[PDB]
RNA sequence: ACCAUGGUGACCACGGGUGACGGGGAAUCAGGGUUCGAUUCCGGAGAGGGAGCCUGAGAAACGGCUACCACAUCCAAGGAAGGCAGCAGGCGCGCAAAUUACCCACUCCCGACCCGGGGAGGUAGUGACGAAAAAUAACAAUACAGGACUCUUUCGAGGCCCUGUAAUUGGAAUGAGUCCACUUUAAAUCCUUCCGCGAGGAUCCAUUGGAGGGCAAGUCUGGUGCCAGCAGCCGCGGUAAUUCC
């Protein structure tokens, strides 16, 4: 019949009741303080922060030294230690229940390029990343929601094909050296 | 009192299958006579030709004339009335056009103050009713 | 030429097929994706034959420029390059002629021969004059 | 009479037509969220009056 | 064939129905459950309807045959040939579903077989079923309105941050688009890469619904006066309508 994949799942989740005023205001001031496009990509990372807390809280109703609690629980924690949301010396299955939504929005590319000083005015970081200026070590990436790890966190910089790291100016500086040199010397 | 002992699961399961025939939304979905009776025949929309405009009168607290038609279908053709759900849009429809009547909002019960209409008109003559109302589309030439 | 560097990796030779097969990655900072025939002469100066037994294909530029990567292979001889080679990559640099009819004709030709038995004088001229 | 079956579309056909004029376009998407994160939250309104809503008149 | 009178059943037989193909599964989600499962995997059934056979290890085979039934083609009227629930497509039914395209290069299969064939399958066209990423602007110099930072003070305005008017600009900003060349593939297309063009109402124009309550948002103005209409529900409308237009 077909060698097609067939597999996909949704990433976000719609809220249970809508229009309640205390939610969509405190969930509004995430859309501007970390600079996002719409509430789907808050509902994205909320569902990410949900299922981790689902998995971790399932690991507390287990008895101690349970073989899959020791394996899968520790592999969980080093997965959110390598991404830089959980500081390493305090690794427990109980400190993860205190992790909130605000610490996943810090580990994006789009705001690890604001605080590193590569850009100002967080909405300007989308105007730099998506408009193809900013690389991770040898791979330029136009994605705001690129959750940058802690290892490759020192190596955010502009790129070599990029204007800010190389040359060959774009069509407006080339026009500005043309608008005086197109009808005269 | 009810049964409880480790042997009565035939009695309890047989007592449940015959007492579920006493709420409506199991009975109209599993007896079969309720879907051999609705004009849609278990579908969501239906085309049918317009026989006659009729103006029904709203409920007692209110006082107006709700604009309606007398559509007779093409799928196992049956006589129904349908509402024209807009301000001026009865004037778009004429004699023996074909219209796509839809459900009207609360599963075969009448909404609003129109006494006993069950259906509403969208898409007269294959052009949308909101498109006619907003000036997007028109009748053929 | 100037800054187009030919790294390769996962080298493997075999006397099953008399080829040398390896994974090629080409690192080019500020150019377009380099041609196949621009590179297959650069393997002629790495494994020291002539650019006739080097077939390079499957080049896939990564996002943002820089490292495109492909697969390439080198036979031991040209008479080995004709035997155990698929006929299309042998035609990358013209060495095989596959210009036939479309397959819609060849089926109808086969179904028109099918209605004629035995008469070899008409089993071949089965509607070949009407052109 | 009481509007029997004729004069369908009575009040639509006799409302006077005021033309839909134009303004500068609204910003779409991400920049639209910026201009209302600023309007509701970062700008503390020093005046009172039981904190009247954004469409007040 | 000759004898025996047995078997099943309210622990639901038997008969009927099913919008009944069964399952791995899917949606749901406290636990118990509810509902779907024609559909790529396994198995079964059938090629218009029933039936009978031939060959063959394996068929009661239908892109095999014989006959009836049903439907239908050609005829020079003596006869002939039919079976798309295969791929495209056509009519028809409908609320409701893609091109009479490219190739065996890939995954496998069959054969006398390193070589032939495969509408299996692969590739593209259609594709807002659906799912994942993700543009439609960002910084400034005035600028007008606010901030625990300013004088020995509600003096006087700010050298300092944020916002919005309304700007004027600009510049190692860029895409959608255009278009060479590669790359891509069986051949092409895409996608990635890359020259060259490509933004000041960036007019290179974001919509669909709402604004009485549930339920987030106006008692703003004009019109209509239980009329036209709205309203899933409660309700709004009879000359100032926070609900119609």
Curated annotation (Swiss-Prot), chain A:
The modification Phosphoserine is found at residues 152, 162. Residues 161-185 are annotated as: Disordered. There is a cross-link at residues 92, 138 (Glycyl lysine isopeptide (Lys-Gly) (interchain with G-Cter in SUMO2)). The modification N6-acetyllysine is found at residues 65, 115, 154. The keyword Heme does not apply. The keyword Cytoplasm applies. Changing residue 136 to F: In a breast cancer sample; somatic mutation. GO terms for cellular component: cytoplasm; cytosol; cytosolic ribosome; cytosolic small ribosomal subunit; extracellular exosome; focal adhesion; membrane; nucleolus. SMART domains: Ribosomal_S4 (SM01390), S4 (SM00363). Residues 107-181 form the S4 RNA-binding domain. InterPro entries: Ribosomal_uS4, Ribosomal_uS4_CS, Ribosomal_uS4_euk/arc, Ribosomal_uS4_N, S4_RNA-bd, S4_RNA-bd_sf. It is found in: Cytoplasm; Nucleus, Nucleolus. Keywords: Acetylation, Cytoplasm, Isopeptide bond, Nucleus, Phosphoprotein, Ribonucleoprotein, Ribosomal protein, RNA-binding, rRNA-binding, Ubl conjugation. It holds the Pfam family Ribosomal_S4. GO terms for biological process: cytoplasmic translation; positive regulation of cell population proliferation; ribosomal small subunit biogenesis; translation. GO terms for molecular function: RNA binding; rRNA binding; structural constituent of ribosome; translation regulator activity. Belongs to the universal ribosomal protein uS4 family. Component of the small ribosomal subunit. The ribosome is a large ribonucleoprotein complex responsible for the synthesis of proteins in the cell. Part of the small subunit (SSU) processome, first precursor of the small eukaryotic ribosomal subunit. During the assembly of the SSU processome in the nucleolus, many ribosome biogenesis factors, an RNA chaperone and ribosomal proteins associate with the nascent pre-rRNA and work in concert to generate RNA folding, modifications, rearrangements and cleavage as well as targeted degradation of pre-ribosomal RNA by the RNA exosome. Component of the small ribosomal subunit. Identified in a IGF2BP1-dependent mRNP granule complex containing untranslated mRNAs. Part of the small subunit (SSU) processome, composed of more than 70 proteins and the RNA chaperone small nucleolar RNA (snoRNA) U3.
From Swiss-Prot, chain B:
The modification N6-succinyllysine is found at residue 53. Changing residue 66 to K: In BTDD; decreases hydroxylation of the protein; decreases the accuracy of translation; decreases levels of incorporation of the mutant protein into ribosomes and polysomes; patient cells become highly sensitive to oxidative stress. It comes from the Eukaryota. Gene3D superfamilies: Nucleic acid-binding proteins. GO terms for molecular function: RNA binding; structural constituent of ribosome. It is found in: Cytoplasm, Cytosol; Cytoplasm; Rough endoplasmic reticulum; Nucleus, Nucleolus. GO terms for cellular component: cytoplasm; cytosol; cytosolic ribosome; cytosolic small ribosomal subunit; endoplasmic reticulum; membrane; nucleolus; nucleoplasm. GO terms for biological process: cytoplasmic translation; maintenance of translational fidelity; ribosomal small subunit biogenesis; stress granule assembly; translation. The modification 3-hydroxyproline is found at residue 61. Component of the ribosome, a large ribonucleoprotein complex responsible for the synthesis of proteins in the cell. The small ribosomal subunit (SSU) binds messenger RNAs (mRNAs) and translates the encoded message by selecting cognate aminoacyl-transfer RNA (tRNA) molecules. The large subunit (LSU) contains the ribosomal catalytic site termed the peptidyl transferase center (PTC), which catalyzes the formation of peptide bonds, thereby polymerizing the amino acids delivered by tRNAs into a polypeptide chain. Component of the 40S small ribosomal subunit. Part of the small subunit (SSU) processome, composed of more than 70 proteins and the RNA chaperone small nucleolar RNA (snoRNA) U3. This is Small ribosomal subunit protein uS12. It comes from Homo sapiens. The lineage of its organism: Eukaryota, Metazoa, Chordata, Craniata, Vertebrata. The gene is RPS23.
UniProtKB/Swiss-Prot annotation, chain C:
One of its GO terms (biological process) is ribosomal small subunit biogenesis. Keywords: Acetylation, Cytoplasm, Diamond-Blackfan anemia, Isopeptide bond, Nucleus, Phosphoprotein, Ribonucleoprotein, Ribosomal protein, Ubl conjugation. There is a cross-link at residue 36 (Glycyl lysine isopeptide (Lys-Gly) (interchain with G-Cter in SUMO2)). It is found in: Cytoplasm; Nucleus, Nucleolus. Residues 100-118 have a biased composition (Basic residues). It comes from the Eukaryota. The modification Phosphothreonine is found at residue 8. GO terms for molecular function: RNA binding; structural constituent of ribosome; translation initiation factor binding. Residues 91-131 are annotated as: Disordered. PROSITE patterns: RIBOSOMAL_S24E. Disulfide bonds: none annotated. Component of the small ribosomal subunit. The ribosome is a large ribonucleoprotein complex responsible for the synthesis of proteins in the cell. Required for processing of pre-rRNA and maturation of 40S ribosomal subunits. Part of the small subunit (SSU) processome, first precursor of the small eukaryotic ribosomal subunit. Belongs to the eukaryotic ribosomal protein eS24 family. It is linked to Diamond-Blackfan anemia 3: A form of Diamond-Blackfan anemia, a congenital non-regenerative hypoplastic anemia that usually presents early in infancy. Diamond-Blackfan anemia is characterized by a moderate to severe macrocytic anemia, erythroblastopenia, and an increased risk of developing leukemia. 30 to 40% of Diamond-Blackfan anemia patients present with short stature and congenital anomalies, the most frequent being craniofacial (Pierre-Robin syndrome and cleft palate), thumb and urogenital anomalies. Component of the small ribosomal subunit. Part of the small subunit (SSU) processome, composed of more than 70 proteins and the RNA chaperone small nucleolar RNA (snoRNA) U3. This is Small ribosomal subunit protein eS24. The gene is RPS24.
């Amino acid at each position: 019949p077909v060698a097609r994949s067939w597999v996909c799942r949704k990433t976000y989740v719609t809220p249970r009741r809508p229009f309640e005023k205390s939610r969509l205001d405190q969930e509004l001031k995430l859309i501007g303080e970390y600079g996002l496009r719409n509430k789907r990509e808050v509902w994205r990372v909320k569902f990410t922060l949900a299922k981790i807390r689902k998995a971790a809280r399932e690991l507390l109703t287990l008895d101690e030294k349970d073989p899959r609690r020791l394996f899968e629980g520790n592999a969980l924690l080093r997965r959110l230690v390598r991404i830089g949301v959980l500081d390493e010396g305090k690794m427990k299955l109980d400190y993860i229940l205190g992790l909130k939504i605000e610490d996943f929005l810090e580990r994006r590319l789009q705001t690890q390029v604001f605080k590193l000083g590569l850009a100002k005015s967080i909405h300007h970081a989308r105007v730099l990343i998506r408009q193809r200026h900013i690389r991770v070590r040898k791979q330029v990436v136009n994605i705001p929601s690129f959750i940058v790890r802690l290892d490759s966190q020192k190596h955010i910089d502009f790129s070599l094909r990029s204007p800010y790291g190389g040359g060959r100016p774009g069509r407006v500086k080339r026009k500005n050296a043309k608008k005086g040199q197109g009808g005269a010397g | 009192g009810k049964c409880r002992g480790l042997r009565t699961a035939r009695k309890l399961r047989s007592h449940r299958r015959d007492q579920k025939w006493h709420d409506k939304q199991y009975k109209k979905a599993h007896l079969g006579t309720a879907l051999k009776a609705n004009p849609f025949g278990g579908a969501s929309h239906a085309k049918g030709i317009v026989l006659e405009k009729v103006g029904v009168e709203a409920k007692q607290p209110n006082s107006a004339i709700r604009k309606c038609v007398r559509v007779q279908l093409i799928k196992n053709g049956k006589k129904i009335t349908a509402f024209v759900p807009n301000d001026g849009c009865l004037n778009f429809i004429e004699e023996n056009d074909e219209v796509l009547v839809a459900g009207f909002g609360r599963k075969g019960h009448a909404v609003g103050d129109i006494p006993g209409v069950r259906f509403k008109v969208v898409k007269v003559a294959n052009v949308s009713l909101l498109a006619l109302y907003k000036g997007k589309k028109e009748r053929p030439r | 030429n100037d800054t187009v560097t030919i790294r390769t990796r996962k080298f493997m030779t075999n006397r099953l097929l008399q080829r040398k097969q390896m994974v090629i990655d080409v690192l080019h900072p500020g150019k377009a994706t380099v041609p196949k025939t621009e590179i297959r002469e650069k393997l002629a100066k790495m494994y020291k034959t002539t650019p006739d037994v080097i077939f390079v294909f499957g080049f896939r530029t990564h996002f943002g420029g820089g490292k495109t990567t492909g697969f390439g292979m080198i036979y031991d001889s040209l008479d080995y390059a004709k035997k155990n080679e698929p006929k299309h990559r042998l035609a990358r640099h013209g060495l095989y002629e596959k210009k036939k009819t479309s397959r819609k004709q060849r089926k109808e030709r086969k179904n028109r021969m099918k209605k004629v038995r035995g008469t070899a004088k008409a089993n071949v001229g089965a509607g070949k004059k009407p052109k | 009479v009481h509007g029997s079956l004729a004069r369908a579309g009575k009040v639509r056909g006799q409302t006077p037509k005021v033309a839909k004029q134009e303004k500068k376009k609204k910003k779409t998407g991400r920049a639209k969220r910026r201009m209302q994160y600023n309007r509701r939250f970062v700008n503390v309104v020093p005046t009172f009056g039981k904190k009247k809503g954004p469409n007040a008149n």
